Structure 1
Amino acid sequence: MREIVHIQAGQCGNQIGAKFWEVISDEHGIDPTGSYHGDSDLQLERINVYYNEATGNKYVPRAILVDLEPGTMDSVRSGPFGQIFRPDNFVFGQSGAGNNWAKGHYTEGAELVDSVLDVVRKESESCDCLQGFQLTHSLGGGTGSGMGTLLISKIREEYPDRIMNTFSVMPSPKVSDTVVEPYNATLSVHQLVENTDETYCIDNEALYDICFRTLKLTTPTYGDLNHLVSATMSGVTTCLRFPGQLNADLRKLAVNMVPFPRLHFFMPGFAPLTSRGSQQYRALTVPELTQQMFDSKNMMAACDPRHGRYLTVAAIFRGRMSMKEVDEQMLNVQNKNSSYFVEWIPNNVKTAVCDIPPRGLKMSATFIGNSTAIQELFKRISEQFTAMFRRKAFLHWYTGEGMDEMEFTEAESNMNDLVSEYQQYQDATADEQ
């Protein structure tokens, strides 16, 4: 039994995790009270992947909620699915990080890390065969970055062989709500590239553009972005919970998408997306899904694939469909857009097909890209970093917590090195003399 432990630290991660549990409970037919009222027996075939059984037939999510402030915890508990969680797993403090990485990692998180790791150990011991971990956290700078990387470091030390997964919202240039984003982003990504095994980049600007252009919404809110991220998260772990003609377990992906250990930053996407106004005019089929899948506007990281080349791609289909159609469509995408794909790799489109589509769709698809452009997402942050590190703009708050200056330089150098390896393989040729 492949079962996963879920953690959620910070405000953004907690909100996304709440919507994720909403979506998962809807998929598996779990009421907010924790009881089953679904339709098909297949929902109970692999309920233990995310849930744990409780004596009165009930089901408790295998979730651990973390935050330094109590507001997000109260908001989640005072919510639609607030009562589904285990109260003993609500570990939190009473002093916020104040958008301070040093405060989250070194001073305030050091006191709580023992409690969160004790709860994580209790949850992990009960599992028959643990597969991996999940952790939702934004790189804004508060509880998320600091205590998330602390948790990843501790768990990687404790469980060196179980697959680690994270879902993160990168900073954006046009959408920003705090003044110290680049520092926290660089400091967090140092530990992420050191420790994690898969990280799925998410950008608020891309989600807003998807909302305005593809979904044609008028006044999007955070709920829609959490909905999209939840769709991606559910799509990634579809083959552990339902059967299909071709299974794509998390470790299969870990082998397939990652050529070298450090290039494990991925670009997510979902299809179909119709805007509730052009639903009648669209023909939902595998060729059309593939057309929407490899479109620049449909990716959530705010990067242009046309400004790079793909190292790897994974298309997790869900529904009843022919394998010839999928294979031919992936081959056509390879041949028609050959200039945007790496040459050394003979085939770089992993394929997965599941038998149980979403609740209200005949078929759906999840996209997991790995391309060079992603450099442009990191590169901009580095520029901003220099623009505030040339003068030590706000470092005196971090140094107060006991962080030396050199750590910033180390993290910046690691950023630059990671950018250099994505370009290493991105000019399209490599020969002549």
Structure 2
Amino acid sequence: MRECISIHVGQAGVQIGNACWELYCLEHGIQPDGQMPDSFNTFFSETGAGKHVPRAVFVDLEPTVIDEVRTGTYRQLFHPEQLITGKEDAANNYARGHYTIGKEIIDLVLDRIRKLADQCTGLQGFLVFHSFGGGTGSGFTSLLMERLSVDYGKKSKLEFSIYPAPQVSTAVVEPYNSILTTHTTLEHSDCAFMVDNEAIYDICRRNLDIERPTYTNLNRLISQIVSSITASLRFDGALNVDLTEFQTNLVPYPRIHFPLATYAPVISAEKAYHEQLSVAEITNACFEPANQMVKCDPRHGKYMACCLLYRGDVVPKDVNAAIATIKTKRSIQFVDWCPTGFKVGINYQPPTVVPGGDLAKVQRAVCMLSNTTAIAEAWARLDHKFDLMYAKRAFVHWYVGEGMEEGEFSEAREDMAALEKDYEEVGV
């Protein structure tokens, strides 16, 4: 019945997806060969005897990242036809992703997706993993999203996106790609969860006591959030949340579909012994700016809706108490047009932890998804960055070379301006 199809696009998407699939396997007791020595069906198809296969498609315009998957630990988990590889990359160029390189591979991926979807009898929708900055993650994803919207439309679309940081950006052209993908994103995807690597790094250093976090550390954390989102479908709790339900609760207007997530508790092995990590505590920690996945100040914004997804040894009464306490905190403000700003999910299964992971095993955890006007600040800085570069037409020629027109850039900018303005208007 209830099944979710995962699409992993570009390097970032692939690597997050690897982590996710490692976690899922451990959660459901599926070995790396697909064997298990029922709810897992939401993520896996079952074929013959002693096999389960992820309902996932992995896509990259290069072979390198996917080739690791083929060689590696989980080579037997995925069948070869679900791992799609081109020959040349998008080379950090949106145009190459959306047009020049993407138009060669999109049909193939669509066909495979259709095949996958035909095997599922109760399609909930799609989880799309990518980045806004890369040529593939932007250009290819926008194309793919359009096609999916056309073919399916009413089936839900969710994207988990690595947003570019204010300070710590790894690539030069990021603002252009980000702006371009946003335009199509707004048109198509139904809710989009932004995340920032810088914030994750801060969290890992401050809360987990890790001097030097690598990408593997971020990815693991990110996967946890996804698990919290999908645990309501993969397990049977006391009080549950479906994806459609989530959408209904968390998105007040069609355009305003960017809720930023956060997780609690993120703690070390030792630092867990001393702390009495109660429901109240974790809830309180959720609404603190320092534990956010996107860099911004909520104190300077207003909340429009928050969804709290609890998991493990949690009882409703104490959650209610926590919520009440949060209500009475003047520094956490909700917009006046939504007096009741909470959707609450409680699931029985404690968060499972990956062997060799940075996170300690806890009885309780929470994933908060909140829509807040403060996210507009990120867009403002990104827009500013875009505007500087465009003032000199820096790098623009490359995009033009691959068939992009200058007018598109301007259009995209306009679209983002309009979006920011919309956000402004709802907070009044």
* TM-score bin (small chain): over 0.9
DSSP 3-state at the match of 2:6: strand
Q: Is the 8 A contact 2:299 2:332 kept in 1?
A: no
Paired with 1:309 and 1:128, the residues of 2 have a C-alpha distance of: 40
Q: Give 1:36 deviation, angstroms.
A: 1.0
Q: Is the 8 A contact 2:95 2:135 kept in 1?
A: no
Deviations 1:31-76 (A, max 9, x none): 0011113xxxxxxx21111100111231010111111100011112
Q: Does 1:387 align with 2:406?
A: no
Among residues 42, 46, 49, which one is paired with 2:39 in the alignment?
Answer: 46
- Return 204-213 or 331-340, whichever deviates more: 331-340
Paired with 2:13 and 2:134, the residues of 1 have a C-alpha distance of: 12
Q: Give 1:338 deviation, angstroms.
A: 6.3
Q: Normalising to structure 1: TM-score of the pair?
A: 0.95
Alignment-derived partner of residue 356 in structure 2: none
Q: Does 1:94 align with 2:87?
A: yes
The amino acid that maps onto 2:230 is T
The amino acid that maps onto 2:21 is W
The amino acid that maps onto 1:397 is W
Q: Is the 8 A contact 2:264 2:366 kept in 1?
A: yes
Deviations 1:326-362 (A, max 9, x none): 1121122022136521122111011110111223421
DSSP 3-state at the match of 2:322: helix
Q: Give 1:173 deviation, angstroms.
A: 2.1
Among residues 337, 343, 352, which one is paired with 2:345 in the alignment?
Answer: 352
Alignment-derived partner of residue 401 in structure 1: 402
Alignment-derived partner of residue 230 in structure 2: 237
- Return 270-279 or 186-195, whichever deviates more: 270-279
Alignment-derived partner of residue 363 in structure 2: 362
- Summarize the alignment of residues 317-356 of structure 1 with structure 2, pairs less than 5 Å apart: 317-337=310-330, 340-356=333-349
Give the total of aligned pairs. 420
**Identity of counterpart residues, as a percentage?**
42
Alignment-derived partner of residue 106 in structure 1: 99
Alignment-derived partner of residue 213 in structure 1: 206
Paired with 2:330 and 2:22, the residues of 1 have a C-alpha distance of: 38
Q: Give 1:222 deviation, angstroms.
A: 0.3
Alignment-derived partner of residue 116 in structure 2: 123
DSSP 3-state at the match of 1:155: helix
Among residues 133, 138, 141, which one is paired with 1:140 in the alignment?
Answer: 133
Instruction: Name the CA shift for 1:251/1:187 in 2 (closer, same or farther; >3 Å).
Output: same
Paired with 1:30 and 1:234, the residues of 2 have a C-alpha distance of: 15
Structure 2 alignment gaps of length 5 or more: 353-360
Deviations 1:369-394 (A, max 9, x none): 11001011111110011001112111
Alignment-derived partner of residue 357 in structure 2: none
Alignment-derived partner of residue 411 in structure 2: 410
Q: CA-atom RMSD, angstroms?
A: 1.2
Q: Is the 8 A contact 2:33 2:75 kept in 1?
A: no
Alignment-derived partner of residue 7 in structure 1: 7
The amino acid that maps onto 2:160 is F
Paired with 2:295 and 2:332, the residues of 1 have a C-alpha distance of: 21
Among residues 191, 216, 227, which one is paired with 1:223 in the alignment?
Answer: 216
Among residues 53, 74, 84, which one is paired with 2:67 in the alignment?
Answer: 74
DSSP 3-state at the match of 1:247: coil
Instruction: Name the CA shift for 1:278/1:264 in 2 (closer, same or farther; >3 Å).
Output: same
Paired with 2:410 and 2:166, the residues of 1 have a C-alpha distance of: 22
The amino acid that maps onto 2:145 is I
The amino acid that maps onto 1:419 is E
Paired with 2:167 and 2:209, the residues of 1 have a C-alpha distance of: 20
Paired with 2:240 and 2:273, the residues of 1 have a C-alpha distance of: 32
Paired with 2:269 and 2:239, the residues of 1 have a C-alpha distance of: 31
Among residues 150, 153, 172, which one is paired with 1:160 in the alignment?
Answer: 153
- Return 247-256 or 410-419, whichever deviates more: 410-419
Deviations 1:182-236 (A, max 9, x none): 0000001111111001110000110011011111211110011101110001101
- Runs (4+) off by over 6 Å: none
Q: Does 1:185 align with 2:167?
A: no
Alignment-derived partner of residue 373 in structure 1: 374
Alignment-derived partner of residue 29 in structure 2: 29
